[PDB]
């Protein structure tokens, strides 16, 4: 009974949360991905002059 009471309390804690819209989280992820496009040596390969593993 105590275990189920703790489970109920945990669910209560989980329920009371402010959630943003999905269309906003996707926009934020797109903004972060686009703002760091020219910083990924795996996405846009760096020339061989600055590659430590040439």
């Amino acid at each position: 009974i105590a275990q189920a009471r703790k489970l109920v309390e945990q669910l209560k804690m989980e329920a009371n949360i402010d959630r943003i819209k999905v269309s906003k989280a996707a926009a934020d992820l797109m903004a972060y991905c686009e703002a760091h496009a020219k910083e990924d040596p795996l996405l846009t390969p760096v020339p061989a002059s600055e590659n430590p593993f040439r």
């Binding site: 989980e14 999905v22 989280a25 760091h36 795996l42 996405l43």
Partner: protein, 338 residues
């Protein structure tokens, strides 16, 4: 009052489900429709590290993105200089059954653990020049699955007794015990600001814990089998999991729901490891079919394939500056790709 507790739990579950459902205006696959594809990603192997005589089970990169540590099932922890392929240290272990290894952010310590329910901390900066056991933590009743350093004095471990622990290396005593899972915890990932961490278990669930106070904040479900790997998005507001059903999934912390599913029809094996690139638009996942797949993180289509390992790709890592990818497999070879 079993009936009242059951009905309250069902009411809370339905309320949470309805609240999460009412927050999905569109889909991430719909918003990312007009963006340009990444194209074809062709990576070549630049180095091969040899010296392990058994299956490699774990690996970790250094903060400087030059030194790495690898653990295999022959009682040896080997520290490699990736630039020159040289061996810096070879630490013999008291137990040959190791399932995880970690590297301190400062670089002065290394951690190991496995079937023995003990986490061993080794010091790499001894005055005599030899590595010796600095600490041993033995408060777990199940095998250790993962361990990650917070500072030079703190470490978070996950075990097979459905619990996680936060330790104090100076005194060797537990500080916080994160309980709530109903299955063996397989993976563990720290937030970039080291104030939250996600843990995935064999009950097909993931939980978000806060290190300071020590309670579960959010629970994420949707997978069908055990979650073998977990990783944090570089921003820290999302994470990715990989399961035994040949599927990866992307979850958002603020939206509190799934975003995208990465799966194919020619893949039926399991995912052993996942990782993100520095920008965050590439997801690298190692499989049991001896291959590693690179997916576009914004459009759920495969972008590249890494092949060359004889056996299961057991461990995968990306350097902090994102210049190379290290993959370790059961054929006792580590390959660096760029």
């Amino acid at each position: 009052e079993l009936d009242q507790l059951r009905q309250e739990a069902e009411q809370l579950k339905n309320q949470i489900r309805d609240a999460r459902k009412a927050c999905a205006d569109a889909t991430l696959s719909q918003i990312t429709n007009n963006i340009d594809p990444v194209g074809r990603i062709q990576m070549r192997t630049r180095r091969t590290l040899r010296g392990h005589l058994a299956k490699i089970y774990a690996m970790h990169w250094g903060t400087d993105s030059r030194l790495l540590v690898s653990a295999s099932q022959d009682g040896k922890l080997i520290i490699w200089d990736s630039y020159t392929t040289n061996k810096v240290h070879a630490i013999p272990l008291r137990s040959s059954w190791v399932m995880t290894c970690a590297y301190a952010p400062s670089g002065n310590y290394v951690a190991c653990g496995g079937l023995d329910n003990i986490c061993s901390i080794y010091n790499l900066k001894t005055r005599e020049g030899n590595v010796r056991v600095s600490r041993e933590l033995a408060g777990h009743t199940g095998y250790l699955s993962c361990c990650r350093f917070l500072d030079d004095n703190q470490i978070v471990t996950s075990s097979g007794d459905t619990t996680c622990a936060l330790w104090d290396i100076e005194t060797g005593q537990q500080t916080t015990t994160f309980t709530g899972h109903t299955g063996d915890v397989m993976s563990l990932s720290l937030a970039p600001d080291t104030r939250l961490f996600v843990s995935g278990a064999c009950d097909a669930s993931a939980k978000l814990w806060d290190v300071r106070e020590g309670m579960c904040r959010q629970t994420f479900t949707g997978h069908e089998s055990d979650i073998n790997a977990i990783c944090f998005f570089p921003n820290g507001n999302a994470f990715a999991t990989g399961s035994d059903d040949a599927t990866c999934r992307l979850f958002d912390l603020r939206a509190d729901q799934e975003l995208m599913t990465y799966s194919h029809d020619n893949i039926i094996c399991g995912i052993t490891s996942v990782s993100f690139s520095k920008s965050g638009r590439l997801l690298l996942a190692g499989y049991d079919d001896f291959n590693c797949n690179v997916w576009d993180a914004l459009k759920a289509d495969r972008a590249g394939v890494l092949a060359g390992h004889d056996n299961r790709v057991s461990c995968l890592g990306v350097t902090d500056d994102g210049m190379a990818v290290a993959t370790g497999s059961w054929d006792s070879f580590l390959k660096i790709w760029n």
